[PDB]
């Protein structure tokens, strides 16, 4: 009389311990493999007053290639994987499977654009903890990579027609979420630290900062972005500034596949049937969610 | 995050300030 | 931490000839090695940085060479303006603890010249003041090495004199030196003969200048 | 393509502190890092520390343990060096120096450790001695080149403080054959030196030989006739 059933499971990519674990790991890797020559951070006392802490340490310049990694299940635990089409990242999952480790990941610290991540299987998918809340970041997962090549020459190359198509398809998806009649518009960052305002990322150990204005000025050949390599930066790991050594060889290069984006929607009390979206990012945890959203670890019961 | 200095700088530009992880963002 | 050693301490070379200065680090410094030139009464002047890159304005006769813990500064043809003191400096360690070598003085090589010796007894003006300084002068000699021996009543002195040497003369490339014997007016009057005995490569025999107090 | 100008000479008492200034002009201040170097009399160069202006972070030579502080004033393109609890052996000439680091204001930085631009230096004398003019004693011709011909004469500029002192002969008309020796610091804590010149023996009697001794710290100007008899 007993009946066979698939173990259903509810997921929440926005409250997934794995994302925090990864965050702490990348920070570990950096703290041990990419140390700044000088680090400035606020040193405070419970009262609220702060002073700048200064850390000077050996900062060997290392040319690094991406080391693929993955997260695996410890004894007594299991990693569940949601296999549903267009999975929202939240709620019950119909087709679930189990795995020993997650897929191979080539983590990348960056803003605005997600580089070298996983592509969506079907069409472009967009996810947010709550679309109605404009303060919640929108994670865009592309189904087609747009190659972006940079050179120490001070600029990165991006196919224009390719990116134009991308913006349109993303717009379409946003319309599927907010209304087929609303007008979709992309605008540059409203501002903030350089890291937040530009499309920044670390490639081969160097810190790139690119003007992404061209990238997000759209209405519903090559696109050359003015980029720059910086030695003095604001840290993503914690509040503070860091200084690293200058580039070695010279004529720095980088080739990456734009596989996602982090967007923000302008709070709109203004009734006009139009939605505006700008480049987002900053908290690197959203970068980790883009890769870990379909996994959930559970106790073997 | 340095939220105090973030708000002040963003505000002087007619915008609101807030932390985006450990970075300052102007909304 | 990282010690920079220069050699030779002093290098004598004829104008127009070549000069090779040496600098050694107590450990690898890669290529963060600079060379400076300094004349007396003046500020150092940058010559080479990055071990082999000549600074803007520095003549092509100055070329830097080396890497690791062994470096060299070569001056293909010495000119009047090059005779000075040269310092190397490493700036490769971090946290930064930059350091200089103790320097190499580049001097003009010329023919040997014996000094003229003169002794000056203390003046009555100085005696009235309670002290007595006896001065021994060695005029225009070369090389720089010389020896002054003070004798009071034929007794060899020591621990009571100060020597001073000029920079190499810009006209005849010689040196001049003074040796001052300093005693109380009380001890000066207790002795009769004060002598200065000078030894130098240019003197076949020691030259002694002396006087009998009063 | 700059200019570094330092403040004037200083005389300090043991245990006190000094603050040397260095004004930079000619280019964007924050695009340079500045270093301080000291040179004790008769010695070599000694690295004291360097400040990364754009970060307002300074690093120091280990042996200057908490006694030295290097600061910069972006508002006035001025760098300062402070050395506390001075000791007599802190005496020396202090040099301010700097080098271009690149577009620091844009986040670029070479972090160069060599020194291209140099101040003129500032002499700091640390001593318990109080300022005082030298006593000028005649060094009369006597033995010299036997029977005459060439006579040597001079002046003994004794017990003065602090350095420097200027010696001249006949208001500067007599310079050939003149040798002014570098001062020597005596046990008393005061300096002394001698200035001599070779003149024809026949010249004495008809011509006068005067050593002019100027010591600005004590505003003293003393002429001294050096006679044979
Ligand atoms: C598990 O069973 C459910 C309901 O019978 C079904 O919809 C789902 O596809 C099954 N999962 C798989 C892929 O085995
Ligand atoms: C996912 O579940 C849906 C609904 O049961 C089903 O149509 C689809 O085949 C499943 N995916 C697979 C092939 O596991
Ligand atoms: C990617 O998804 C878009 C819809 O968002 C679709 O137009 C496009 O054909 C898809 N690309 C492919 C074939 O993977
Ligand atoms: C989603 O965010 C909106 C903000 O506009 C809020 O009003 C709503 O209550 C939120 N819904 C949930 C599930 O919390
Ligand atoms: C991007 O750079 C890679 C690096 O080798 C190259 O293989 C690829 O052809 C480039 N793509 C473009 C933009 O032409
Ligand atoms: C993206 O992956 C490519 C291919 O391995 C690599 O060369 C590049 O450095 C990566 N981009 C990053 C992590 O900046
Ligand atoms: C870079 O920023 C400037 C701000 O003056 C903007 O006008 C420019 O268009 C940006 N560069 C790009 C991506 O076109
Ligand atoms: C996305 O889809 C899931 C399940 O289909 C649904 O529960 C959720 O409300 C949707 N959007 C949100 C709020 O994540």
What 3-state class would DSSP assign to A263?
strand
Which residues does residue C207 pair with via DSSP β-bridges, in sequence order?
C198
User: Is the Cβ atom of A33 under 6 angstroms away from ligand 2?
Assistant: no
- Closest by CA to C115, choosing from C165, C162, C170, is C165
Query: CA-to-CA distance for D18 and C56, rounded, in angstroms?
Result: 34
Which of D57, D59, D107 is the closest to A231 by Cβ?
Answer: D107
Q: Which of A119, A124, A125, A176 to mutate to test the pocket of ligand 3 (most atoms within 8 A of CB)?
A: A124
Tell me how many degrees the CA angle C84-C86-C90 measures, rounded to the nearest 5: 165
The bridge status of strand A38-44 relative to strand A77-82 is unpaired
Method used for this model? Answer: X-ray
User: Could you tell me the two tokens for D205?
Assistant: 């009697």
Q: Dihedral sign, CA of A82, A85, A90, A91?
A: negative
Establish whether residue A143 lines the binding site of ligand 3, counting it when its CB lies within 6 angstroms of any ligand atom.
yes
**Quick check: B13 and A191 in contact, CB under 8 A?**
yes
Bridge partners (DSSP) of residue A185 are: A219, A276
Show me where the domains of chain D are located.
Answer: 1-128, 129-228
Range of the domain at A49: 1-301
**In CATH, D129-228 is 3.90.105.10:** no
**Chain position carrying tokens 């802190």:** D90
| Calpha distance C81→C62 (Å, rounded) | 12
User: d(Cα C188, Cα D147) in Å, to the nearest integer?
Assistant: 27
**Chain CA centroid to CA C201, Å:** 17
Q: How far is CA D4 from the centre of its chain?
A: 17
Contact assessment for residue A182 and residue A266, using Cβ atoms and an 8 Å cutoff: no
Entry resolution (Å):
2.2
- Chain A, nearest residue to D59 by Cα: A56
Asked, as a colleague might, if the bond just before D204 is cis with ω within 30 of 0, I would say no
**What is the spatial distance between Cα C185 and Cα C128, in angstroms, rounded to a whole number?**
8
CATH number of the domain bearing residue A26: 2.170.40.20
Residue-wise burial string across D114-136, b where 16 or more C-beta atoms lie within 10 A, e elsewhere:
bbbbbbebbbbbbbebeeebbbb
Which among D6, D114, D192 is the top mutation candidate for probing chain C, defined by the most C β-carbons within 10 Å of its own β-carbon? Answer: D114
Strand bridging mode A125-127 / A241-243: unpaired
Q: At A195, phi and psi to the nearest 5?
A: -55, -40
Residues C199, C201, C206: CA angle, nearest 5 degrees: 30
Cβ pairs A/B, distance under 8 A: 52
Q: Is the Cβ–Cβ distance between B23 and A192 less than 8 Å?
A: yes
Place of tokens 């930079």: D24
CA distances from D62 to D33, D68, D83, D120, D123 (A): 19, 10, 14, 25, 22
Q: Which chains touch B (3 or more CB pairs under 8 A)?
A: A
Residues 6+ apart with CB under 8 A from C83: C106, C107, C108, C168
Q: Distance (Å, rounded) from C-alpha B13 to C-alpha A125?
A: 34
Which partners does chain D have (≥3 C-beta pairs < 8 Å)?
Answer: A, C
Picking from A38, A40, A233, the nearest residue to D107 by CB comes out as A233
Strand ranges for chain A from DSSP E: 9-12, 38-44, 50-56, 77-82, 90-93, 96-99, 113-115, 125-127, 138-151, 155-159, 183-186, 199-203, 206-210, 218-219, 222-229, 232-234, 241-243, 253-265, 274-279, 295-299
Backbone dihedral region for residue B18 (phi beyond 0: left; psi -120 to 50: alpha; all else: beta): beta
- Which is it for strands A155-159 and A222-229: parallel, antiparallel or unpaired? antiparallel
The answer, yes or no, to whether any atom of ligand 1 lies below 6 A from the CB of A6, is yes
Encoded tokens for D97: 């120096």
Q: Count of domains in chain A? A: 1
Q: Domains along chain C? A: 1-110 (2.60.40.10), 111-213 (2.60.40.10)
CA distance D33 to chain C (A): 13
Cα C180 from chain centroid (whole Å): 18
Residue that is written with structure tokens 């890497």 in the block: C67
Enter the CATH code of domain D1-128: 2.60.40.10
Number of domains in chain B: 1
Q: Can you say whether the dihedral through the CA atoms of A39, A45, A51, A56 is positive or negative?
A: negative
Which range marks the domain in which residue B17 is found?
A: 2-27
Let me know if chains C and B touch, i.e. at least 3 Cβ pairs under 8 angstroms.
no
Closest residue by Cα to atom 1, ligand 3, is A123
> How far apart, in whole angstroms, are the C-alpha atoms of residue D193 and residue A85?
96
What phi, psi does D161 have (nearest 5°)?
-160, 130
- Residues, chain D: 229
Cα distance from A243 to chain C (closest Cα, Å)?
Answer: 13
Whether C135 and D182 lie within 8 Å, measured CB to CB: no
Residues of A in contact with C95 (CB under 8 A): 56-58
**How many Å apart are CA A41 and CA A237, to the nearest integer?**
11
Closest CA to ligand 1's atom 4? A6
DSSP assignment of D171-194 equals GGTB-TTEEEPPPEE-TTS-EEEE
Nearest atom in ligand 2 to A85's CA: 1
Atom of ligand 8 nearest to the CA of A128: 14
Rounded to a whole number of angstroms, the distance between the first and last alpha carbons of chain A is: 23
CA terminus-to-terminus distance, chain D: 59
Strand positions, DSSP E, chain C? 4-7, 10-13, 19-25, 33-38, 45-49, 53-54, 62-67, 70-75, 85-90, 99-100, 104-108, 116-120, 131-141, 147-152, 155-156, 161-165, 175-184, 193-199, 207-212
> Do the domains D1-128 and D129-228 sit in the same CATH topology, yes or no?
yes
Query: Is the beta carbon of A94 within 6 A of some atom in ligand 1?
Result: yes
Please say whether the beta carbons of A177 and B7 come within 8 A.
no
Show the ligand 6 pocket: residues with CB < 6 angstroms. Answer: A 66, 106, 108, 115-116, 201, 203-204, 254-256
C-alpha C59/C-alpha C80 separation (Å) is 13
């Amino acid at each position: 009389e007993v009946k066979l059933e698939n173990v259903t499971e509810n997921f929440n990519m926005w409250k997934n311990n794995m994302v925090e674990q990864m965050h702490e790991d990348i920070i570990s890797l950096w703290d041990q493999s990419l140390k700044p020559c000088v680090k400035l951070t606020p040193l405070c006392v419970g009262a609220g007053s702060c002073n700048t802490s200064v850390i000077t340490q050996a900062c060997p310049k290392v040319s690094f290639e991406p080391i693929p990694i993955h997260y695996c299940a410890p004894a007594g635990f299991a990693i569940l994987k949601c296999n549903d089409k267009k999975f929202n990242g939240t709620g019950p999952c119909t087709n679930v499977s189990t795995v020993q480790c997650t897929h191979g990941i080539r983590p990348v610290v960056s803003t605005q654009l997600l580089l070298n991540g996983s592509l969506a299987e079907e069409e472009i998918v967009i996810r947010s903890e709550n679309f109605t809340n404009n303060a919640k970041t929108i994670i865009v997962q592309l189904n087609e990579s747009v190659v972006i090549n940079c050179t120490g020459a001070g600029h990165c190359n991006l196919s224009k027609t390719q990116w134009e198509n991308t913006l349109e398809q993303i717009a379409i998806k946003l319309k599927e979420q907010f209304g087929n009649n609303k007008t979709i518009i992309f605008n540059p960052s409203s501002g903030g630290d350089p890291e937040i305002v530009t499309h920044s990322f670390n490639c081969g150990g160097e810190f790139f900062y690119c003007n992404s204005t061209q990238l997000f000025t759209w209405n519903d050949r090559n696109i050359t972005l003015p980029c720059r390599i910086k030695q003095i930066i604001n840290m993503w790991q914690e509040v503070g500034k860091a200084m690293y050594a200058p580039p070695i060889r010279g004529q720095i290069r980088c080739s990456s596949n734009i596989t996602g984006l982090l967007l923000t929607r302008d709070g709109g009390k203004d009734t006009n049937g139009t939605e505006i979206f700008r480049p987002g990012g900053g908290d690197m945890r959203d970068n980790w969610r883009s890769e870990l959203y379909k996994y959930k670890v559970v106790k073997i019961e | 995050x340095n939220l105090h200095f973030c708000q002040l700088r963003c505000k002087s530009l007619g915008l609101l300030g807030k932390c985006a992880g450990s970075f300052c963002a102007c909304x | 931490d990282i010690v920079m050693t220069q050699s030779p301490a002093t290098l004598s070379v004829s104008p127009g000839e070549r000069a090779t200065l040496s600098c050694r680090a107590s450990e690898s410094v890669s290529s963060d090695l600079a060379w400076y030139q300094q004349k007396p009464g003046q500020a150092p002047r940058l010559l080479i940085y990055g071990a082999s890159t000549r600074a803007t304005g520095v003549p092509a006769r100055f070329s830097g060479s080396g890497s690791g813990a062994e470096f060299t500064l070569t001056i293909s043809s010495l000119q009047s303006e090059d005779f000075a003191v040269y310092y190397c400096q490493q700036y490769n360690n971090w946290p930064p603890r930059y350091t200089f070598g103790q320097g190499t003085r580049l001097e003009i090589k010329r023919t040997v010249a014996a000094p003229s010796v003169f002794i000056f007894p203390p003046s009555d003006e100085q005696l009235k003041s309670g002290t007595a300084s006896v001065v021994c002068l060695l005029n225009n000699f070369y090389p720089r090495e010389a020896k002054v021996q003070w004798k009071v009543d034929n007794a060899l002195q020591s621990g009571n004199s100060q020597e001073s040497v000029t920079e190499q003369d810009s006209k005849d490339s010689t040196y001049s030196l003074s040796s001052t014997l300093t005693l109380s007016k009380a001890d000066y009057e207790k002795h009769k003969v004060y002598a200065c005995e000078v030894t130098h490569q240019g003197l076949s025999s020691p030259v002694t200048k002396s006087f009998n107090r009063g | 393509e700059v200019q570094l100008v330092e403040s004037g000479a200083e005389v300090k008492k043991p245990g006190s502190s000094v603050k040397v200034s260095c004004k930079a002009s000619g280019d964007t201040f924050i695009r340079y890092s500045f270093t301080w170097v000291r040179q004790a009399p008769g010695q070599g160069l000694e690295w004291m520390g360097r400040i990364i202006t754009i970060l307002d972070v300074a690093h120091y030579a280990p042996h200057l343990q908490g006694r030295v502080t290097i600061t910069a004033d972006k508002s006035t393109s001025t760098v300062y060096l402070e050395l506390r609890n001075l000791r007599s052996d802190d005496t020396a000439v202090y040099f301010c120096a700097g080098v271009y680091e690149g577009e620091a204001d844009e986040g670029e930085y070479d972090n160069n450790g060599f020194l291209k631009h140099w101040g003129q230096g500032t002499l700091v004398t640390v001593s318990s001695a109080s300022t005082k003019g030298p006593s000028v004693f005649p060094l009369a011709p006597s033995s010299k080149s036997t029977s005459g011909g060439t006579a040597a004469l001079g002046c003994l500029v004794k017990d003065y403080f602090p350095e420097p002192v200027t010696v001249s002969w006949n208001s500067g008309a007599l310079t050939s054959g003149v040798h002014t020796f570098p001062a020597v610091l005596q046990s008393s804590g005061l300096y002394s030196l001698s200035s001599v010149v070779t003149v024809p023996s026949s010249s004495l009697g008809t011509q006068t030989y005067i050593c002019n001794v100027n010591h600005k710290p004590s505003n003293t100007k003393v002429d001294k006739k050096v006679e044979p008899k």
